[PDB]
Design a protein around this ligand. Structure first.
Ligand SMILES: Nc1ncnc2c1ncn2[C@@H]1O[C@H](COP(=O)(O)OP(=O)(O)O)[C@@H](O)[C@H]1O
Ligand SMILES: Nc1ncnc2c1ncn2[C@@H]1O[C@H](COP(=O)(O)OP(=O)(O)O)[C@@H](O)[C@H]1O
Lengths: 23, 197, 541, 505
């Protein structure tokens, strides 16, 4: 007989950064 | 310094932690006039970052640490534009001034520069040292380099014809001189030195 | 049959590596001395190192040397790629790395080449992904731990070795770092790449080794392959007798150099296009050609040569052409950057750009750098009390540190070119940085300018260049180029040799863009520089 | 040219292997076929396979996988060893975008394994194999650079005809009792962009329209058909005609005849053979008129490439980026040689950098310096051509109006206004009793944009009148005119639209 299987691998997110100017 | 926000201070922390971990260590800060600038007030984002970097330097050299052996050497050319919070014992205690060399010092400089150069036996450097004033070590280097170039010129045009650089080579090289530091710039250093004294 | 022999003989070897002599010998001995005889390491009572971090520009030949050592020794070359082993499934890339190491430890003492390690070593602090830190920890576990490695050496490859973990660059993992970054090596690569084909009898490899001054080594094979393709392509338009007298020639290599330009290197005339300035040409030729042609005589004398030359004067004089003409005869590169093409509104970007240009300069010796608009870059920092003033101070200090700071000054020829030398601080004009204060200021020179501009042009016997140069009276090289361009436009209009009436109708529409007071200012500055050189004579000792 | 190139690349490395070896170059390995879909890459592959008696092991993209793990590498090795075993031949790998997922956006492992297997099988071909590979793709961007590396795929063709279309028509439609008044040359001429399957869909829709024609008249009796309607079947010319119709200029610039003649002749001559120039680029328009119309007519009817940008379109409020945009624009220009870079509103970009002393002044100076150093570096090679246009020529930089960079100065009336109004009112059901010469004589200092605005206000007023009459007819029906109560735009609509018409400049 056959059988099934569950799988949950990962995820990927995106970040936000702050910069500094010199006028 | 870095483009982003709060990264120049992470850089300073990292290098100073590296220094404290691998003690004893000599950290040579070259041209403090860039980083350690007088905080005061500039009214700009650059002013804010250039103040944050100075404050980080103060708390890293004299803050809550274990006082492990780390010797900070600063080398500047505009010491009037450095925050007095740096110019203080505990961070940078002694301000060594290096004026232009005197006659004996410049003669010793020439002898040190020609330590590994074939020279004539009868060519004393006292005349070239006494026939100059206001020069710097870089200027003496320039004179030596010009003399070497004329000697190589002679060797090539002869082509061991001329193993030694000769008096006429040195005289022709000294025919033109650099005079790097002008009196206009030197009087400011004299004023600073006497004000410190 | 035959296939198993050919695939044995086609293998690479130590005879197929050129220019990387000392590092190739070093890797060869440190790999083969454990493999040829372990009794020596038993007698000395120590374990050999088991890690090589190779770094340099991409396309150098590092994996070729690793494959050559793996072919010359009875090892098993297993290739692991960087972005190939990384995946999005949790616990899968670590399983792939463990399987690769178990396969390398199962069969025989082998050599592992993991390529592009900078993609899978994000230093565990700058990254955000967990899988990258997990595979970093898997790499440190497979390289060091309890019964970590049993007679197997790993080799790495990267372009920037600073973006690796300090725990990865430790002893036992990557304890040896090899910098695989000249003309004789390029000639050796040309000789080993032109070995299996009779190109010709009159092909000289000296020009091929001197003109391709920025080729990394992986482009030389593509150059020779492109030449061998273009020869058969151009020799098949009309066609036992065809196979005779085949091969590439000098014009085939010239066409390969022209059709293909990229040198896989981040790098930005022949003594004839410049007119006049004979003593300036002689001085630049001397102070550039002597430290390149005669290093042995300079090491015999025991002195370092001069580096910096600074030009100043009116615009449209030929300073950029002079820099190209002194760069073009040596085998050096040419990085010509402009003044205001590096400043940015951010904090630290201009100094980062200065550090990248000087690093790319010192990454390929020799290299002449052409800094333009020194009055726009330096500005004689002094005191401005503002954000732009602080940015100018930081740019000047970074530039002063890159010229003479904590460096080695191997082979860098900085040449400055401005039109306002009074706005330069007295720290870049110090000897050791820009010591050569060469001033670039007639009709006899304009004759040479017109002769250098009309090099490959069909000329008329009835035109008089002396009569053209006599009516200038203070023109510039840009004005002469404008006159030549107007004459060429009139020639192509008459076509759609150069005639005399084109010049006769173009001499009236002159410009003379330079005024007189700027010439008086330049003469006053030159006279002040002449009067500053005082109390100096033949100076008898 | 591409057909001759692929014929050389499939003949010379397949018929004279001895000559190639004697020459000493073994670069030829795999060829790539990219371009827009429906151009004839599969047709060229079939023509290559039917022009040579060599072996032809066709392998499509997703037909390489199976339930068994690793079976794809075994299938690739089997195909490569069969092509090396049988004869010096050619391998066709169709739809490579499924096998090569570009290796960076994917996350699987059997795709990486089959890409590594295809790499190590394409690299492991010696001189005695004498086999080539051909690969077709749809998009030219989702390919591994390791597959595009030197050694496997370096010689790609860019397939961007009527005889092959007539051949495909005579191949398909030659198995039917067709007609007696058909000319397939006209169908091959009028069919422009079809490839392979679209002609089959055209014939299928022709058959469907024939069946629709011979159904509503002869009463097929769907319960049980007769036998007289089977033999009496013919796909006539009109069925193919409306099957093509139901499936999927320089004369437009009135006036300025000598101006457009000089412009076209000059453009043609610069891009023509350079022998005359060797023996012996740009332009700018300014005035109060149709400058962008002339740039559109150049971009359409010059038989050359065209890339146009607006004035401040390439500006970044940051630093560097605003120069990198122009840098990679000129990189795309030098890549697609020859080309025309239509810089609209040059003044907005240049602004005569001069002195402004600010962040905007620094950005303007950096933009002008980038433009000068990326335009003055154009030699006789790569033959780019910069076209500028402006309304105010006062504020343009004299550093960009210099000789050697951009020297031409094209200066750009009533008759041109009448021609512009007649070209704007081309596909419009106008009222027959209407003359535009009164609007041409009344409007003097106007422009084509405001003439279009006038025409659009007239169309809006006519549409309002039409919708009012339609709602009046609906109210009268709920409490019949023609298809439209106002089918044409009367003179009253123009006389009411010109009430609120201004000038642009
Ligand atoms: N020193 C060398 N001698 C001979 N060929 C070389 C040398 N360096 C590079 N090559 C050639 O350059 C190509 C690329 O080098 P390789 O080491 O395979 O990869 P990479 O491009 O990563 O350096 C090879 O095909 C090889 O023939
Ligand atoms: N002596 C000369 N001989 C020939 N051409 C010259 C000479 N001097 C200047 N030119 C021409 O004048 C132009 C000057 O341009 P460039 O070198 O960029 O400017 P600048 O002289 O202001 O530094 C060059 O394109 C060059 O062709």
């Amino acid at each position: 007989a056959a059988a099934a299987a569950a799988a949950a691998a990962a995820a990927a997110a995106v970040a936000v950064a702050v910069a500094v100017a010199a006028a | 310094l870095s483009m982003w926000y709060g990264e120049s201070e992470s850089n300073i922390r990292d290098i100073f932690d590296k220094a404290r971990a691998a003690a004893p260590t000599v950290v040579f800060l070259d041209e403090l006039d860039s980083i350690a600038k007088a905080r005061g007030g500039s009214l700009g984002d650059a002013g804010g970052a250039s103040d944050r970097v100075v404050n980080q330097l103060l708390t890293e050299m004299d803050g809550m640490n274990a006082k492990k052996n780390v010797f900070v050497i600063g080398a500047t050319n505009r010491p009037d534009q450095i925050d007095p919070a740096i110019l203080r014992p505990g961070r940078l205690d002694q301000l060594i001034y290096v004026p232009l060399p005197d006659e004996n010092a410049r003669l010793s400089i020439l002898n040190a520069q020609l330590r590994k150069t074939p020279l004539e036996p009868g060519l004393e450097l006292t005349a070239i040292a006494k026939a100059t004033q206001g020069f710097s070590g870089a200027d003496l280097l320039y004179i030596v380099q010009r003399a070497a170039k004329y000697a190589i010129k002679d060797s090539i045009e002869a082509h061991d014809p001329v193993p030694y650089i000769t008096k006429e080579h040195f005289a022709e090289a000294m025919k033109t001189a650099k005079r790097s530091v002008s009196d206009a710039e030197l009087r400011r250093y004299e004023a600073y030195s006497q004000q410190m004294k | 049959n035959r296939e198993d022999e050919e695939n044995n003989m086609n293998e690479v070897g130590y005879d197929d590596i050129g220019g990387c002599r000392k590092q190739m010998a070093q890797i060869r001995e440190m790999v083969e001395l454990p493999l040829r005889h372990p009794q020596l390491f038993k007698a000395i009572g120590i374990k050999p190192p088991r890690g090589v971090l190779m770094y340099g520009p991409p396309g150098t030949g590092k994996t070729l040397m690793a494959r050559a050592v793996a072919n010359e020794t009875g090892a098993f070359f297993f290739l692991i790629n960087g972005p190939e082993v990384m995946s999005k499934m949790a616990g899968e890339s670590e399983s792939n790395l463990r399987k690769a190491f178990e396969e390398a430890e199962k069969n025989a003492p082998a050599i592992i080449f993991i390529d592009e390690i900078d993609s899978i070593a994000p230093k565990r602090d700058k990254t955000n992904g967990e899988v990258e830190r997990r595979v970093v920890s898997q790499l440190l576990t497979l390289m060091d731990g309890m019964k970590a490695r049993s007679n197997v050496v790993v080799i790495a490859a990267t372009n920037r070795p600073n973006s690796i973990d300090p725990a990865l660059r430790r002893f036992g993992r990557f304890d040896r770092e090899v910098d695989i970054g000249d003309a004789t090596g390029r000639l050796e690569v040309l000789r080993i790449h032109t070995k299996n084909m009779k190109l010709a009898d009159d092909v000289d490899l000296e020009a091929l080794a001197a003109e391709t001054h920025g080729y990394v080594g992986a482009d030389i094979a593509s150059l020779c392959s492109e030449a061998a393709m273009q020869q058969i392509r151009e020799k098949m338009d009309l066609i036992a007798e065809v196979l005779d007298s085949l091969g590439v020639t000098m014009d085939n290599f010239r066409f390969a150099l022209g059709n293909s330009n990229p040198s896989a290197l981040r790098e930005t005339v022949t003594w004839d296009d410049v007119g006049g300035l004979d003593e300036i040409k002689e001085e630049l030729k001397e102070t550039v050609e002597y430290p390149v042609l005669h290093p042995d005589q300079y090491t015999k004398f025991g002195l370092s040569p001069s580096k910096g030359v600074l030009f100043y004067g009116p615009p449209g004089t030929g300073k950029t052409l002079l820099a190209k003409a002194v760069a073009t005869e040596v085998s050096a590169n040419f990085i010509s950057v402009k003044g205001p093409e590096l400043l940015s509104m951010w904090y630290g970007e201009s100094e980062s750009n200065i550090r990248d240009i000087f690093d790319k300069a010192r990454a390929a010796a020799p290299t002449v750098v052409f800094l333009d608009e020194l009055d726009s870059i330096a500005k004689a920092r002094g005191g401005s009390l503002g954000d732009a003033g602080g940015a100018s101070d930081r740019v000047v200090n970074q530039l002063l540190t890159e010229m003479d700071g904590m460096n080695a000054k191997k082979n860098v020829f900085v040449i400055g070119a401005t039109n306002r030398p009074d706005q330069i601080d007295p720290a870049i004009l110090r000897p050791g940085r820009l010591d050569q204060l060469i001033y670039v200021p007639d009709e006899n020179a304009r004759l040479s300018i017109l002769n250098a501009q009309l090099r490959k042009t069909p000329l008329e016997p009835g035109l008089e260049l002396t009569a053209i140069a006599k009516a200038t009276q203070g023109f510039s090289g840009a004005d002469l180029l404008y006159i030549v361009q107007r004459a060429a436009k009139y020639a192509i209009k008459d076509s759609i040799y150069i005639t005399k009436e084109h010049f006769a109708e173009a001499m009236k529409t002159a410009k003379r863009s330079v005024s007189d007071a700027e010439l008086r200012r330049y003469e006053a500055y030159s006279q002040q520089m002449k009067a500053s050189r005082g109390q100096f004579s033949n100076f008898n000792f």
